[PDB]
Design a protein around this nucleic acid. Structure first.
Length: 136
RNA sequence: GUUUUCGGAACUGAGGCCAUGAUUAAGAGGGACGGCCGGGGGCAUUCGUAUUGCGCCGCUAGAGGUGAAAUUCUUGGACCG
Protein backbone atom coordinates (compact mmCIF):
# COMPACT_ATOMS: atom_id res chain seq x y z
CA UNK A 1 0.00 0.00 0.00
CA UNK A 2 2.60 2.55 -1.13
CA UNK A 3 2.79 5.12 -3.90
CA UNK A 4 5.80 6.80 -5.54
CA UNK A 5 4.12 10.14 -6.31
CA UNK A 6 4.89 13.73 -5.37
CA UNK A 7 3.36 15.14 -2.18
CA UNK A 8 4.59 18.73 -1.87
CA UNK A 9 3.60 19.85 -5.37
CA UNK A 10 0.06 18.45 -5.51
CA UNK A 11 -2.45 16.41 -3.53
CA UNK A 12 -4.45 13.21 -4.04
CA UNK A 13 -8.22 13.63 -4.32
CA UNK A 14 -11.17 11.56 -3.21
CA UNK A 15 -14.87 12.11 -2.57
CA UNK A 16 -16.85 11.62 0.64
CA UNK A 17 -20.60 10.99 0.62
CA UNK A 18 -22.03 12.28 3.91
CA UNK A 19 -25.50 10.77 4.32
CA UNK A 20 -27.32 12.09 7.40
CA UNK A 21 -30.88 11.20 8.43
CA UNK A 22 -32.64 12.01 11.71
CA UNK A 23 -31.53 8.75 13.34
CA UNK A 24 -28.20 7.79 11.71
CA UNK A 25 -25.26 9.43 9.95
CA UNK A 26 -22.96 7.91 7.33
CA UNK A 27 -19.40 8.96 6.46
CA UNK A 28 -18.58 7.05 3.27
CA UNK A 29 -15.43 7.70 1.23
CA UNK A 30 -14.96 6.40 -2.31
CA UNK A 31 -12.63 7.15 -5.21
CA UNK A 32 -13.38 9.72 -7.92
CA UNK A 33 -15.50 7.27 -9.92
CA UNK A 34 -17.36 6.06 -6.81
CA UNK A 35 -17.25 2.34 -7.62
CA UNK A 36 -14.25 1.59 -5.39
CA UNK A 37 -14.50 2.55 -1.72
CA UNK A 38 -11.95 3.34 1.00
CA UNK A 39 -13.57 3.37 4.45
CA UNK A 40 -16.91 3.72 6.22
CA UNK A 41 -17.87 4.07 9.88
CA UNK A 42 -21.48 4.88 10.79
CA UNK A 43 -22.66 6.97 13.74
CA UNK A 44 -24.02 3.88 15.45
CA UNK A 45 -20.52 2.37 15.45
CA UNK A 46 -18.98 4.82 17.94
CA UNK A 47 -21.64 5.36 20.62
CA UNK A 48 -22.93 2.19 22.28
CA UNK A 49 -26.34 3.72 23.08
CA UNK A 50 -28.75 3.58 20.13
CA UNK A 51 -30.71 6.62 21.32
CA UNK A 52 -28.36 9.35 20.06
CA UNK A 53 -26.96 7.65 16.97
CA UNK A 54 -27.50 10.91 15.03
CA UNK A 55 -25.72 12.98 17.69
CA UNK A 56 -23.00 15.51 16.79
CA UNK A 57 -20.60 13.57 19.06
CA UNK A 58 -20.92 10.29 17.14
CA UNK A 59 -20.66 12.08 13.78
CA UNK A 60 -17.56 13.92 15.05
CA UNK A 61 -15.90 10.68 16.19
CA UNK A 62 -16.84 8.90 12.94
CA UNK A 63 -15.43 11.76 10.83
CA UNK A 64 -12.23 11.76 12.92
CA UNK A 65 -11.85 7.99 12.44
CA UNK A 66 -12.48 8.29 8.68
CA UNK A 67 -9.92 11.11 8.39
CA UNK A 68 -7.39 9.06 10.38
CA UNK A 69 -7.90 6.04 8.08
CA UNK A 70 -7.63 8.26 4.98
CA UNK A 71 -4.38 9.80 6.24
CA UNK A 72 -3.14 6.28 6.99
CA UNK A 73 -3.78 5.12 3.42
CA UNK A 74 -2.81 8.43 1.81
CA UNK A 75 -5.79 10.57 0.76
CA UNK A 76 -5.30 14.28 1.45
CA UNK A 77 -7.84 16.26 -0.61
CA UNK A 78 -11.52 15.50 -0.47
CA UNK A 79 -14.77 16.54 -2.18
CA UNK A 80 -17.87 16.76 0.00
CA UNK A 81 -21.07 15.11 -1.28
CA UNK A 82 -23.90 15.91 1.14
CA UNK A 83 -27.12 13.89 1.22
CA UNK A 84 -30.20 13.73 3.46
CA UNK A 85 -32.74 10.90 3.63
CA UNK A 86 -34.44 12.38 0.53
CA UNK A 87 -37.49 10.93 -1.17
CA UNK A 88 -40.86 12.15 0.06
CA UNK A 89 -39.90 12.04 3.75
CA UNK A 90 -37.86 15.23 4.28
CA UNK A 91 -35.08 17.24 2.65
CA UNK A 92 -33.40 18.89 5.66
CA UNK A 93 -30.11 17.14 6.57
CA UNK A 94 -29.85 15.40 9.90
CA UNK A 95 -28.12 16.70 13.02
CA UNK A 96 -24.65 15.33 12.31
CA UNK A 97 -23.74 16.72 8.89
CA UNK A 98 -22.27 20.05 10.03
CA UNK A 99 -20.46 18.45 13.00
CA UNK A 100 -19.02 15.70 10.78
CA UNK A 101 -17.93 18.25 8.16
CA UNK A 102 -16.30 20.48 10.80
CA UNK A 103 -14.51 17.49 12.34
CA UNK A 104 -13.38 16.37 8.88
CA UNK A 105 -12.04 19.85 8.08
CA UNK A 106 -10.39 20.28 11.50
CA UNK A 107 -8.53 16.96 11.22
CA UNK A 108 -5.99 18.39 8.77
CA UNK A 109 -7.21 17.65 5.24
CA UNK A 110 -8.17 19.82 2.26
CA UNK A 111 -11.78 20.44 1.25
CA UNK A 112 -12.81 21.00 -2.35
CA UNK A 113 -16.39 21.52 -3.54
CA UNK A 114 -19.44 20.92 -1.33
CA UNK A 115 -22.36 19.40 -3.20
CA UNK A 116 -25.96 18.62 -2.25
CA UNK A 117 -27.03 15.29 -3.80
CA UNK A 118 -30.22 14.52 -1.89
CA UNK A 119 -32.84 12.80 -4.11
CA UNK A 120 -35.47 15.36 -5.14
CA UNK A 121 -38.52 13.53 -6.54
CA UNK A 122 -40.72 14.83 -9.33
CA UNK A 123 -44.02 13.78 -7.70
CA UNK A 124 -43.18 10.28 -6.52
CA UNK A 125 -45.47 7.81 -4.74
CA UNK A 126 -47.56 8.30 -1.61
CA UNK A 127 -45.79 9.28 1.60
CA UNK A 128 -45.99 6.79 4.47
CA UNK A 129 -48.74 7.68 6.93
CA UNK A 130 -52.48 8.26 6.89
CA UNK A 131 -54.54 11.16 5.61
CA UNK A 132 -54.62 12.64 9.13
CA UNK A 133 -50.89 12.05 9.59
CA UNK A 134 -49.16 10.53 12.59
CA UNK A 135 -51.17 11.88 15.53
CA UNK A 136 -49.16 11.78 18.76
C1' G B 1 -148.88 35.30 -75.07
C1' U B 2 -142.96 38.04 -76.77
C1' U B 3 -139.56 41.58 -73.70
C1' U B 4 -138.75 45.89 -71.40
C1' U B 5 -139.93 50.45 -67.21
C1' C B 6 -142.20 47.71 -62.90
C1' G B 7 -134.97 44.83 -60.29
C1' G B 8 -133.41 40.18 -55.03
C1' A B 9 -127.51 38.11 -54.61
C1' A B 10 -122.08 35.20 -55.89
C1' C B 11 -117.49 35.58 -59.81
C1' U B 12 -114.01 37.18 -63.48
C1' G B 13 -111.57 41.31 -67.90
C1' A B 14 -109.18 46.36 -68.29
C1' G B 15 -108.06 51.35 -66.49
C1' G B 16 -107.77 55.40 -62.96
C1' C B 17 -106.95 56.68 -57.93
C1' C B 18 -104.26 56.39 -52.35
C1' A B 19 -98.52 60.93 -49.79
C1' U B 20 -100.61 53.59 -52.34
C1' G B 21 -99.27 50.08 -48.25
C1' A B 22 -93.53 46.98 -43.75
C1' U B 23 -92.77 52.63 -36.60
C1' U B 24 -87.58 51.95 -34.70
C1' A B 25 -83.09 48.86 -33.76
C1' A B 26 -83.90 48.81 -26.23
C1' G B 27 -76.86 50.18 -21.72
C1' A B 28 -83.75 43.27 -24.19
C1' G B 29 -82.37 38.72 -26.77
C1' G B 30 -80.49 35.20 -30.92
C1' G B 31 -77.12 34.66 -35.03
C1' A B 32 -72.91 36.15 -38.37
C1' C B 33 -67.69 38.44 -38.90
C1' G B 34 -62.13 39.85 -37.10
C1' G B 35 -57.87 39.46 -33.83
C1' C B 36 -57.01 37.02 -29.52
C1' C B 37 -57.42 34.65 -24.69
C1' G B 38 -57.82 30.29 -20.73
C1' G B 39 -54.30 23.93 -15.41
C1' G B 40 -62.17 24.30 -20.23
C1' G B 41 -63.20 18.86 -22.81
C1' G B 42 -62.09 14.20 -25.66
C1' C B 43 -58.19 11.06 -28.32
C1' A B 44 -53.12 9.64 -29.64
C1' U B 45 -47.92 10.53 -28.58
C1' U B 46 -43.58 12.36 -25.57
C1' C B 47 -40.60 13.65 -21.11
C1' G B 48 -39.00 14.08 -15.92
C1' U B 49 -36.88 12.59 -11.27
C1' A B 50 -38.40 9.52 -7.33
C1' U B 51 -40.31 4.30 -5.14
C1' U B 52 -39.73 -1.07 -5.38
C1' G B 53 -37.50 -5.51 -7.34
C1' C B 54 -33.42 -7.76 -9.92
C1' G B 55 -27.92 -8.42 -12.31
C1' C B 56 -22.61 -7.20 -11.30
C1' C B 57 -18.37 -4.78 -8.53
C1' G B 58 -15.75 -2.76 -3.68
C1' C B 59 -15.06 -1.82 1.92
C1' U B 60 -17.70 -4.10 5.49
C1' A B 61 -20.93 -5.33 11.29
C1' G B 62 -24.29 -3.26 11.75
C1' A B 63 -28.97 -1.27 9.51
C1' G B 64 -34.31 0.07 10.10
C1' G B 65 -37.56 2.38 13.77
C1' U B 66 -38.99 5.19 18.57
C1' G B 67 -40.13 9.96 23.65
C1' A B 68 -37.41 4.84 24.93
C1' A B 69 -37.18 -0.04 22.97
C1' A B 70 -38.93 -4.44 20.45
C1' U B 71 -41.13 -7.33 16.44
C1' U B 72 -37.84 -6.80 11.50
C1' C B 73 -33.10 -7.61 7.71
C1' U B 74 -28.13 -9.29 8.57
C1' U B 75 -20.33 -12.70 7.15
C1' G B 76 -25.37 -17.31 2.88
C1' G B 77 -22.63 -9.58 3.16
C1' A B 78 -27.75 -6.34 5.86
C1' C B 79 -27.03 -0.78 5.27
C1' C B 80 -24.14 2.56 1.97
C1' G B 81 -21.46 3.81 -2.83
Amino acid sequence: SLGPQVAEGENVFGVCHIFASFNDTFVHVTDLSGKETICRVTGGMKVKADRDESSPYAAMLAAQDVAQRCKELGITALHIKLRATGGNRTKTPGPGAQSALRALARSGMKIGRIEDVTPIPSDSTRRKGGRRGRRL
